[PDB]
Amino acid sequence: RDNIQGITKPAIRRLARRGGVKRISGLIYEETRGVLKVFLENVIRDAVTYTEHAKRKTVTAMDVVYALKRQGRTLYGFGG
Template identity: 55%
Template sequence: MARLNENNLRRATFSSLFRSNGGQGKGKGKAVPRRHRILRDDIQGITKGSIRRLARRGGVRRISATIYDEIRKVIKIRVHETLKNITILLDHKNRKTVMTRDVVYALRRMGTPIYGFGSNDFLARHKEVLVHGH
C-alpha cells in the first residue's frame, strides 16, 4: 500500500485504502496458476459399484461383466436427451438457471414422470377432464 501524505489522502477513498493486491492469494509470493484436474471421460465416474447398487434395487442378482459399459452409454444418451429438453425449456422461458421443476417437466415430457417433486395439482387440474371427459 502506498504511503499516505496530504495530497493522496484527499484522493483516497475508503475502498482504495483497504484494497488488496487482487489475485495473488495469501502470502508474499507471486500468484501461481491453479492446477486443473485432468479431464477424462466423465461417464467413467459412474462406477461399477453404483451400477451394481442400482441393479440390486431393481431386483437383479447377477450382472455380466460386459454390461457396465453398455449401461454407461445408455445413461449418457438419456442425460443428453434430458439436458436437451431442459435447454429448450430454458430458452423458451428466457432463463439461465435450471430449477427442479424444469427437470421434472422435461422428464414428464419424455414419458418418465418422477414423483415426489413439485406440486400434486397436475391431477387436480385434470381431474375434471378425466371425470367428465370434456
C-alpha cells in the first residue's frame, strides 16, 4: 500500500549517524527513502529474474547474493 514511509524518522537518524553526519535537515527523509527504494527495486528485479529463470517461486539468499554480484555490490556471509 504505502510502505515507503515505514523507514522511520529515528531509523534514518541512526543510519545516517552510523554514517557519521552531524545535522539532518528535515528535507533529507523522502529523497533518502526514494533512493533506498530504487536500490531495493534494482536488487529485487534482478533477484526475481534469477528466480523466474530457475523455474522457482521462492526468492533464496543465493538469488539476492547473485543480484549483488551482478550489481558489483557483493555481500559475504550469506553463502557463496
